[PDB]
Amino acid sequence: GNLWVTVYYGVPVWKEATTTLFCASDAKAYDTEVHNVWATHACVPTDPSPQELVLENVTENFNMWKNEMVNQMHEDVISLWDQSLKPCVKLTPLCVTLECLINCNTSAITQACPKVSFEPIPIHYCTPAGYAILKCNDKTFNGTGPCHNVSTVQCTHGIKPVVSTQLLLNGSLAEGEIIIRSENLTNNVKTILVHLNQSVEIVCTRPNNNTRKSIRIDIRQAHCNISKWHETLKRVSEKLAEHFPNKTINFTSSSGGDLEITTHSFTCRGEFFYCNTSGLFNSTYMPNGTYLHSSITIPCRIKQIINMWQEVGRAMYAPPIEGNITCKSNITGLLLVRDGGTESNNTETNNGGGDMRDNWRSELYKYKVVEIKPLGVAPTACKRRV
């Protein structure tokens, strides 16, 4: 016959929004470790009732680059880092519009800079009311793909606060296997990301061993006796080939520049360990790798005058501690883009990452924040008296 409308309440329909979310973060509120200091001051001890009420046959495109929840975590972290980390003398730049003399005059900013500590907190993200944080048990997606056997949460899972480049420390791991994240193969900047389904050992020790500080008118010299690993890189290459089929697989070019994009740059003693492109960056893949063959060696050392991943401009940290440091880790994956172009003939090379908005997005492809739209419309044969 004819068709008429109904509308009703509460019928889980969670269209998009990406608003503020609150943390769930069990600090100690006692340890001087600034991680927990922030995790309690501006963050809150944990939520004990998360209910992953698993989805049925959803089809939702957990597009991992339209999730401003990730930007929100980003800005939360940038908020964390600065009362966390104390730059002695920050030389940040500025100009005020004057068409070409835009007054880019170096703004020096002095402060006080002692040490505290560094130890991540798996924080979690918590939708506001009427909002639901869709998760994803599938992780593949090609980058953009749903998940059958996941659903909502109340607060999220642990997403820690350490930052590093192409390779993390003390951080997440990968759930099922190694998958990748990108799109079109015409020009290919489109940074690719892998989550590596095993762990790896990275450990740097330096008790004193170098009492003599300078060389001329070494303590900053750090030797990272690590491991050996390689087979995870074989899984690396086999994946790469599964997406780069007919070509071999190199890296072949770490051009350089600002140290933080190329070198393994990771946070320990508040500072980082900066070496060249000599290590583990080399092998080619036609059906074999190209390297060789406990804590043996790899030479990544510390600097002091760093750049910020946060806002452009330098920073000037403190002289280090006498020695006896160590940091372990559990690599979740890696950060890579083809060193591509059009000069190339049938060898293929991947090459590097320094944008956090993905550095903490190999952990949030699942999380899609939504409101509720619990008012719903549908057809019936419902109409009133005349």
Binding site: Y9, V11, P12, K15, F22, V44, A129, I372
Partner: protein, 135 residues
């Protein structure tokens, strides 16, 4: 539904599932038959949420008012549907498009329906007076 609210179904469960978990949420909550010196602030932040829950809860649970079914959990409106809007029948409807991927199909009529609904509410007011114009 991940929170004090959204409590009439589970995600991924398609429509019919949530629609019926309505009544069982009812029937399941019907009978009822370390603490740190700065746990203060967590309790505090814990507070808002619940209030805001009720607040929003009402805030449009209220303004189901002009929609003629405030307070409750289940409307049935009185409007003629536009097959141009979804053109689907309860069978696939309730069993498919696990709502989150349901309403995006109609992400635009979001306010046209509020339009027609408050419109028919005023329609009822008009007929009430027409009917009362004699006795």
């Amino acid at each position: 539904g991940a929170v004090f609210l959204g409590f009439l179904g589970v995600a991924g469960s398609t429509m019919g599932a949530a629609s019926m978990t309505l009544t069982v949420q009812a029937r399941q909550l019907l009978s009822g038959i370390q603490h740190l010196l700065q746990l203060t602030v967590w309790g505090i932040k814990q507070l808002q949420t619940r209030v805001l829950a009720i607040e929003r809860y009402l805030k449009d649970q209220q303004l189901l008012g002009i929609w003629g079914c405030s307070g409750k959990l289940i409307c049935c409106t009185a409007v003629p549907w536009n097959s141009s809007w979804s053109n689907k029948s309860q069978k696939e409807i309730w069993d498919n498009m696990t709502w989150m991927q349901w309403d995006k199909e109609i992400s635009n009529y979001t306010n046209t329906i509020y339009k027609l609904l408050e419109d028919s509410q005023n329609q009822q007011e008009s007929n009430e007076k027409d009917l009362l114009a004699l006795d």
